[PDB]
Design a binder for these strands. Structure first.
Lengths: 188, 55, 103, 113, 81
RNA sequence: UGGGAGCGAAGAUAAUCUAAUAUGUAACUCCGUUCAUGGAAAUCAAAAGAGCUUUCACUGAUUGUAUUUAUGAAACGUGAAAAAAAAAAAA
RNA sequence: UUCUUGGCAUAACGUUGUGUAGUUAAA
RNA sequence: CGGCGAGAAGGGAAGUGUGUUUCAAAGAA
C-alpha cells in the first residue's frame, strides 16, 4: 500500500471497524516513534534525543497472560564547544542516535544548522539556531561570550544590553549572599 | 515524473477508443507481444507422482 | 455482464483467454457434442500436431499387420485424413473413461 | 484404559501399491515375520503381504497458540510447511482444500487444508 | 530538444565519483527507506488476520530466495564483459 | 458532543477458573466540529478492466478470528447521491 | 441351481478433539 | 493503392516458471 516507510502496512486497506477496534496490547516489541506517529515528550523537547523517546512494551508467558509496562530512553550528559556561539554549553542531555547524526552532519554547529525541524524533533535546537543567526547579525554582542540561554527570549534579543546588565546584577547578588552564608559558618 | 499520470492518461486512451483511434502513444506499438495464455503449463504434481508409482 | 447488459457499457470489452481448467472443461464438452466457440492456444496446437501423427502411426499397424494393406471400395466413399485424425484423437482422449466400452 | 500386552504389527503389500493391513500377534513371537496372501484392490489380484519393521516433540493446541501469538519457535511449523510444499500440494489447478498458500491480502481462506 | 538540453545540464559534470554511503545520504534528503517487514508483521489485526502465520512466513522466505536468483542474472553480465 | 490524540482498571458473561467478550468501555489531560476530517496511486485486479477522497443500500451476518461464552458496518463487485487538477515567468 | 467361509472373545477395544495417516485430470 | 522521430527513468509490486500486467516513493481550492 501507500506510505510503506510508516508503520501499519496491514491496516490501511481494511474495514473501518478494524481500525476503530484495533488494540494496543497485541504488539510485543516497541515501535519507532517517528514511524508510529507518537507525539514528542517534554523531556525530548528539552534535549537532543534524535530518534529516542519514551516507549511502551508488553509481555507474554506460556499461560496466555499479558501486561504493559513503561520504558525510559537512554540519555547521556556531555559538553559541547560551539564556535559560532563562542560559549561552552555544559550538561547537554544527548543520546547515541544524535551523536551519530552529528558525525554525519560534521559537528555540533553544522548539525543544528543543516538539520530539518522534522528530523531534529527538538525545540532547543531551533532556539540555538535562532541565537546563532542573532549572533551572526550582531557580532558586537557576540564578543561578550555570555551564555546562549540569556538571549533565548525574543525580548532579550530586542534589548541585549539590559539582559547582560541584569545577568551581572543577579550574579553579584548571588555571590554577595553566598559570601555571607559562608562567613556565618566559618570555623575560625 | 511526467506532468500527467497514468491514471489521467487512461482517460485519454478511453477518449481515443471512443473516437475509434485504438492507441498510438504506446511504449511498444510496433513490437509483437507473446500472450500469457500461449504458455505451456506443467500441471499438478500428483499426476506425475502417481505415474511414477505405477511404473 | 457485458453480453447480458450491453447498454451498461459505453465501450464493449474484449474476450479474455481461458485457463487450464476452463480449457479442459471446454474440450470435455466438445466430446459430449456441444459446439464450443473459443480461441485455442499455441501449446495445444503444437502438441496435437504431433499427437495426431502418433495416433495415426499406431492405427496403421493394426491395419497392415492383419493383411489389409491396401484400401478398397469407391474413392468417393472412404473417410478423409482430417476425420481419421479427429476420430483417433477422440478415442485416445477417452481411454480412461467408461465411454470406451460403448465404442 | 486397556491393559493388553499384544504387539502391533503392520503388513504391507508386495506390489508397491501402498496397501497396508492391521492386525495383532502374541508378544512371545517377537522375532517372527508374518506373511499372508490377501486381496489387493490396487491390482485386482491376490498378492503377498509381508510384515514391515515399522518403528518426537508433539505439538498441542496450547503450543500452537503460543507460537502463533508470540512468534517463538516458528521453525516447528515451518518444517511442516516445507514438507507440505515439497510434497504434491498447493497446486493452482485441480485443488479445493488448499489451492494456494494465502490470498492476495495474506489470509488463509480454506479452514480445512 | 536543444533548448531543453541547454537548461537541463547535470550537476555532476567534471567531478570525481562518490561513495555509496554518500549516495545513500544524498538519497535520504529526498526519499526515506521502507520500514523493515519484521516490524510490519505486527500490524496484522487479530480479528481477521493471524499474527504469526507459517504459510505467510514461508511466502516471504520464498520471495527472499527468488531475489538472489534475480540478482545473479544482472551480476553475470559484468563478468561476461 | 459515543468526533480525534495520550494513558487506561473492575463489577458482569463463560451458571466456579485461563484466554476471550465487556472495551481500548469508565475516570484524567488536550484539540473544539463541513471555512472540519481526508486526499489526486511505486494502489487494486489477473490476463478483462476499474481510475483522488467521502455518505447510503445490497451483496452478507457471507468469509475470517474464536469455542467452554462471542465477535464481526471484512475484500472484490453492483445501485444511488454529490462530482474538483493545479488560478501559476514577471510587469 | 450353488455342499463352506468376513474369525476369537461368560470383561469388548475410551467417545470427541490434537497429532499421524488418507482423498480432489471437476459444474 | 497507408511502411524504421521504432519509444518513456532500469526502479517498486504481483507465483516464487513471469517472453506478462501495472506503477513512479516528488506539487496547490
Amino acid at each position: 500500500p501507500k506510505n510503506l516507510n510508516l508503520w501499519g502496512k496491514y491496516l490501511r486497506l481494511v474495514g473501518r471497524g478494524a481500525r476503530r477496534g484495533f488494540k494496543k496490547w497485541q504488539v510485543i516489541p516497541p515501535i519507532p516513534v517517528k514511524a508510529y506517529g507518537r507525539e514528542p515528550s517534554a523531556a525530548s523537547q528539552t534535549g537532543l534525543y534524535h530518534d529516542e523517546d519514551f516507549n511502551y512494551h508488553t509481555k507474554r508467558t506460556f499461560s496466555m497472560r499479558r501486561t504493559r509496562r513503561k520504558i525510559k530512553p537512554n540519555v547521556f550528559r556531555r559538553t559541547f564547544t560551539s564556535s559560532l556561539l563562542n560559549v561552552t554549553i555544559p550538561n547537554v542531555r544527548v543520546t547515541t542516535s544524535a551523536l551519530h547524526a552529528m558525525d554525519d552532519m560534521g559537528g555540533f554547529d553544522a548539525y543544528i544548522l543543516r538539520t530539518p525541524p522534522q528530523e531534529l524533533r527538538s525545540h532547543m535546537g531551533e532556539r540555538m539556531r535562532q541565537v546563532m543567526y542573532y549572533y551572526q547579525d550582531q557580532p558586537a554582542i557576540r564578543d561578550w561570550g555570555l551564555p546562549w540561554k540569556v538571549f533565548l527570549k525574543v525580548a532579550s534579543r530586542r534589548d541585549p544590553f539590559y539582559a547582560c546588565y541584569r545577568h551581572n546584577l543577579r550574579k553579584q547578588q548571588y555571590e554577595a549572599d553566598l559570601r555571607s552564608r559562608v562567613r556565618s559558618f566559618s570555623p575560625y | 515524473p511526467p506532468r500527467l499520470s497514468a491514471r489521467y492518461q487512461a482517460d485519454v486512451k478511453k477518449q481515443y477508443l471512443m473516437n475509434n483511434l485504438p492507441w498510438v502513444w504506446q511504449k511498444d506499438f510496433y513490437e509483437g507481444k507473446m500472450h500469457f495464455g500461449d504458455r505451456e503449463p506443467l500441471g499438478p504434481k500428483v499426476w506425475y507422482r502417481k505415474a511414477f508409482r505405477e511404473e | 455482464r457485458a453480453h447480458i447488459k450491453p447498454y451498461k457499457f459505453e465501450v464493449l470489452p474484449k474476450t479474455a483467454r481461458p485457463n487450464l481448467e476452463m480449457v479442459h472443461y471446454l474440450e470435455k464438452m466438445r466430446a459430449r457434442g456441444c459446439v464450443v466457440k473459443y480461441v485455442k492456444p499455441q501449446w495445444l496446437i503444437d502438441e496435437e500436431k504431433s499427437l495426431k501423427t502418433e495416433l495415426a502411426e499406431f492405427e496403421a499397424e493394426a491395419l497392415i499387420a492383419k493383411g489389409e494393406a491396401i484400401e478398397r471400395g469407391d474413392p468417393d466413399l472412404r473417410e478423409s485424413v482430417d476425420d481419421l485424425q479427429q476420430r483417433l484423437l477422440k478415442r485416445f482422449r477417452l481411454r480412461e473413461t467408461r465411454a470406451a466400452e460403448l465404442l | 484404559r486397556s491393559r493388553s500386552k499384544r504387539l502391533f504389527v503392520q503388513l504391507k503389500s508386495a506390489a508397491m501399491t501402498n496397501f497396508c493391513y492391521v492386525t495383532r500377534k502374541s508378544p512371545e513371537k517377537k522375532n517372527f515375520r508374518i506373511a499372508l496372501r490377501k486381496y489387493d484392490p490396487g491390482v485386482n489380484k491376490h498378492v503377498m503381504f509381508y510384515e514391515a519393521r515399522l518403528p518426537k516433540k508433539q505439538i498441542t493446541l496450547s503450543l500452537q497458540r503460543y507460537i502463533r501469538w508470540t512468534g517463538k519457535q516458528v521453525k516447528l511449523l515451518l518444517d511442516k510447511v516445507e514438507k507440505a510444499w515439497e510434497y504434491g500440494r498447493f497446486q493452482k489447478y485441480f485443488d479445493n482444500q488448499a489451492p494456494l498458500l494465502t490470498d492476495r491480502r495474506g489470509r488463509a481462506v480454506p479452514r480445512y487444508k | 530538444m536543444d533548448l531543453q538540453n541547454e537548461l537541463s545540464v547535470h550537476w555532476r559534470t567534471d567531478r570525481p565519483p562518490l561513495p555509496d554511503w554518500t549516495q545513500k545520504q544524498i538519497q535520504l534528503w529526498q526519499h526515506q527507506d521502507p520500514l523493515p517487514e519484521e516490524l510490519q508483521i505486527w500490524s496484522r489485526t487479530k480479528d481477521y488476520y493471524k499474527i504469526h502465520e507459517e504459510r505467510f512466513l514461508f511466502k516471504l522466505k520464498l520471495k527472499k530466495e527468488r531475489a538472489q536468483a534475480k540478482q545473479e542474472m544482472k551480476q553475470q553480465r559484468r563478468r561476461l564483459e
